[PDB]
């Protein structure tokens, strides 16, 4: 019967919740009480990239920490050179409605997608020197919200159809499909080892997925509204979520609990992007307050603010070497903060 | 450097194309269309000339782009903000929905649901300033439907004859009672005129009005 399984199912949530309390020995805030603070983090706009004629939704750094990508509703995908602020490529999109970007780890490929329900992959290194579109991954039924390359052939995408998928670019078919989210999936983050990835959905939950098996290992709750951004800790043993509850939370994968909440009474708008520092000591979160805060990731003390944007800070990414932090916004400008 | 210099030559040749095409594109007119499945958006688009379907037609040297977002079947909360700043919001409702009901809900009138969508859209925080063109289609069909069937069925409080004129009127103002931003947005309602297809000329005229009112901002009238 439905009630047999339901009265059963609500019990299974109890042992999960019962065991999590038993493993809640002491709060990270108590353990990190005597750590010396990070001090005022004064970070200034070094470079400002101009050339977008609409609001920016997505940006992604390169693995060489110098090039980066950005997409906007103007239907242009631009590859920047952050050092010399000069445009390397300006890719016209078939669909002006683009909500995500990814720059391949090898830098041979770039991918974008949005309301067109397609993940388009553009080839950068092309004999005829004109970025050409390679493949169009059309297997989703809702807007694509995120996409992250594993290799030049594997890309994992999260969509508004409550499902994530792992693709094979050569064949253009979903190698694996991740199901179990009861709300629209907003963002995903890959583990450093590229064996696991966590996804945040509109159902106020984050799920840890396994890329090979295709089954969800753990599910984290605690937020009150949509989860809009997610990133792993550098060591791949923790991750942070940005929600519309104007709180950032640091979850652990081994302890399977929540550690911190980064909430401030002053802040009432929703978090749009989150990202870490190379050491994992700073958690940069791009709010709707038009500004971007920098949190002490082990003290939960707002040490630093990056207020330079007219409109909301849509995307926010840090370099692999951690020498810079770049924030996009709806004001059509990318700013490199160092 | 020799290299760096040639580089930035490209970067400016990029920027020339950007601005240029940005201005070719900014010249186009962007209408967002919404509605119920049977609103007859399909029949409107037919009159005017996957996922988000885009439609292109020109009228009196004006280019129109229509973003039929009918099928997204996802949380509108997350993707509507993308269309903020479309010139106007064409909204189609079929007048023939007063006696119906969705096959999914028990007895919630299709018309009462049409209002709720409009309610949430005319009162959407992202379109505080946007004008709303309201096409009310299916007028003839409403005429026949009303000629036999009462309107009290849908509006229990209705003081008026089943005369098409009076009947429609109530509704029109009824839809226009949804907006809280009374002189913040202007609702230009038209009744679908099948044959003349001046459905489009109404649009031409509707568009200009909103544009003209907006120009009174850009013209430095302040």
């Amino acid at each position: 019967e439905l009630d047999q399984l339901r009265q059963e199912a609500e019990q299974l949530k109890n042992q999960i919740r019962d065991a999590r309390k038993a493993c809640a020995d002491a709060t990270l805030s108590q353990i990190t009480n005597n750590i010396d603070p990070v001090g005022r983090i004064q970070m200034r706009t070094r470079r400002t990239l101009r050339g977008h004629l609409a609001k920016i939704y997505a940006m992604h750094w390169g693995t060489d920490s110098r090039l980066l990508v950005s997409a906007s509703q103007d239907g242009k995908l631009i590859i920047w050179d952050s050092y010399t602020t000069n445009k390397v490529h300006a890719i016209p999109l078939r669909s002006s409605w683009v909500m995500t970007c990814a720059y391949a780890p090898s830098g041979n490929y770039v991918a974008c997608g949005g309301l067109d329900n397609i993940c388009s992959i553009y080839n950068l290194k092309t004999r005829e020197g004109n970025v050409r579109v390679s493949r169009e991954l059309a297997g989703h039924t809702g807007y694509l919200s995120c996409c992250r390359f594993l290799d030049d052939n594997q890309i994992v995408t999260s969509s508004g159809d409550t499902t994530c998928a792992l693709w094979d670019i050569e064949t253009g078919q979903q190698t694996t499909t991740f199901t179990g989210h009861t709300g629209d999936v907003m963002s995903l983050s890959l583990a450093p080892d590229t064996r696991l990835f966590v996804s945040g959905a509109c159902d106020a939950s984050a799920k840890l997925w396994d890329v090979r098996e295709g089954m969800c290992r753990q599910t984290f709750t605690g937020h009150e509204s949509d989860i809009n951004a997610i990133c792993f800790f550098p060591n791949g043993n923790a991750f942070a979520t940005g929600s519309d509850d104007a709180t950032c939370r640091l979850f652990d994968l081994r302890a399977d609990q929540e550690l911190m909440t980064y909430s401030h009474d002053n802040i009432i708008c929703g978090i749009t992007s989150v990202s870490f520092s190379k050491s994992g000591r700073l958690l940069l979160a791009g709010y709707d307050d038009f500004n971007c805060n920098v949190w002490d990731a082990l003290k939960a003390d707002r040490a630093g603010v990056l207020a330079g944007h007219d409109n909301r800070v849509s995307c926010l990414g840090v370099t692999d070497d951690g020498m810079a932090v770049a924030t996009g916004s709806w004001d059509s400008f990318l700013k490199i903060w160092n | 450097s020799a290299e760096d210099k040639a580089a930035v030559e490209r970067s400016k040749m990029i920027d020339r194309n950007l601005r240029e095409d940005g201005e070719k594109a900014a010249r186009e007119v962007k209408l967002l269309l919404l509605g119920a499945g049977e609103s007859g958006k399909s029949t409107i688009v037919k009159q005017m000339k996957t996922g988000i379907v885009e439609t292109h037609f020109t009228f009196k040297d004006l280019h129109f782009k229509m973003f039929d977002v009918g099928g997204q079947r996802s949380e509108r909360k997350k993707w509507i903000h993308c269309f903020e700043g479309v010139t106007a919001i064409i909204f189609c409702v079929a007048l023939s929905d007063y006696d119906l009901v969705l096959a999914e809900d028990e007895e919630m009138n299709r018309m009462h649901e049409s209002m709720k969508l409009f309610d949430s859209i005319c009162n959407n925080k992202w379109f505080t300033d946007t004008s709303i063109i309201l096409f009310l289609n299916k007028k003839d069909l409403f005429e026949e439907k009303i000629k036999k069937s009462p309107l009290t069925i849908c509006y229990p409080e209705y003081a008026g004859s089943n005369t098409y004129e009076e009947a429609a009127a109530y509704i029109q103002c009824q839809f226009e009672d949804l907006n809280k931003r009374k002189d913040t947005k202007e609702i230009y309602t038209h009744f679908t005129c099948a044959t003349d297809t001046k459905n489009v000329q109404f649009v031409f005229d509707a568009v200009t009005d909103v544009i003209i009112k907006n120009n009174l901002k850009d013209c430095g009238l302040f």
Partner: single-chain antibody, 232 residues
Framework: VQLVESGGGLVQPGGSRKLSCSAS????????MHWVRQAPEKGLEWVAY????????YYADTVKGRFTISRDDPKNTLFLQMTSLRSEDTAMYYC??????????????WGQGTTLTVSSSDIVMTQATSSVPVTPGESVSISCRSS???????????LYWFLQRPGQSPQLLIY???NLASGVPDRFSGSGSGTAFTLTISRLEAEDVGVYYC?????????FGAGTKLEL
């Protein structure tokens, strides 16, 4: 992606002839083109250059004010207008394409060039090795020397390498020091700093025997070096 040029042949001195290079199979409108001439017995020598969209036109010392270079983007052609040819303009005129953006490979593709026989503050690159004997399966190193520090401020040593097999157009091997061109085996490698440069081949074959060239790109007019022919 082939490039073919038209013209050349036999011209009396003082005559004005035109060279047309019809690009085919690539985005010609976004490629900075060059012209490079090779004397019948001597090495390469840069002559002209046009940027993308005819924004920047440069020339060599020997052809300044004597040559006019133009491009026709819609027809995918490149033109060279030569005026009052001298006896020292007898050379094979290759046409080279190059695109300049972060990480690009300029001078990657070379035309077949045309034969032209007239009737009758500059960096100098020096390599004093010619007709060096070598056997297949051995390791050979080719050394180059500059008169100026090619290592720019940003760390880019704008030194290039080329390989001209007998009876073929020159082919890029190394577009900057410690970099490897597209479609060239891993055997070729180059390590150097400032004014000292080397090209190391681990194991060679009958296919890569020929003459090698060194070019700098720190500043115009892109002076080349003398040849370095591998003997086999």
């Amino acid at each position: 992606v082939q490039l073919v040029e038209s013209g050349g042949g036999l011209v009396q001195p003082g005559g004005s002839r035109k060279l047309s290079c019809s690009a085919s199979g690539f985005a010609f409108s976004s490629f900075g083109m060059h012209w490079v001439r090779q004397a019948p017995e001597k090495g390469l020598e840069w002559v002209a250059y046009i940027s993308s969209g005819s924004g920047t036109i440069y020339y060599a010392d020997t052809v300044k004010g004597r040559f006019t270079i133009s491009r026709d983007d819609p027809k995918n052609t490149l033109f060279l207008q030569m005026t009052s040819l001298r006896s020292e303009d007898t050379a094979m005129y290759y046409c080279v394409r190059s695109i300049y953006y972060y990480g690009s490979s300029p001078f990657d593709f070379w035309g077949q060039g045309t034969t032209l026989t007239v009737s009758s503050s500059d960096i100098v690159m020096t390599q004093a090795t010619s007709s060096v004997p070598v056997t297949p399966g051995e390791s050979v190193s080719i050394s180059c020397r500059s008169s100026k520090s090619l290592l720019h401020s940003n760390g880019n040593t704008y030194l290039y390498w080329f390989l001209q097999r007998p009876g073929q157009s020159p082919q890029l091997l190394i577009y900057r020091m410690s970099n490897l061109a597209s479609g060239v085996p891993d055997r070729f490698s180059g390590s150097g700093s400032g004014t000292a440069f080397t090209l190391t081949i681990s194991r060679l074959e009958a296919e890569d025997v020929g003459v090698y060239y060194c070019m700098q790109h720190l500043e115009y007019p892109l002076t080349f070096g003398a040849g370095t022919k591998l003997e086999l």
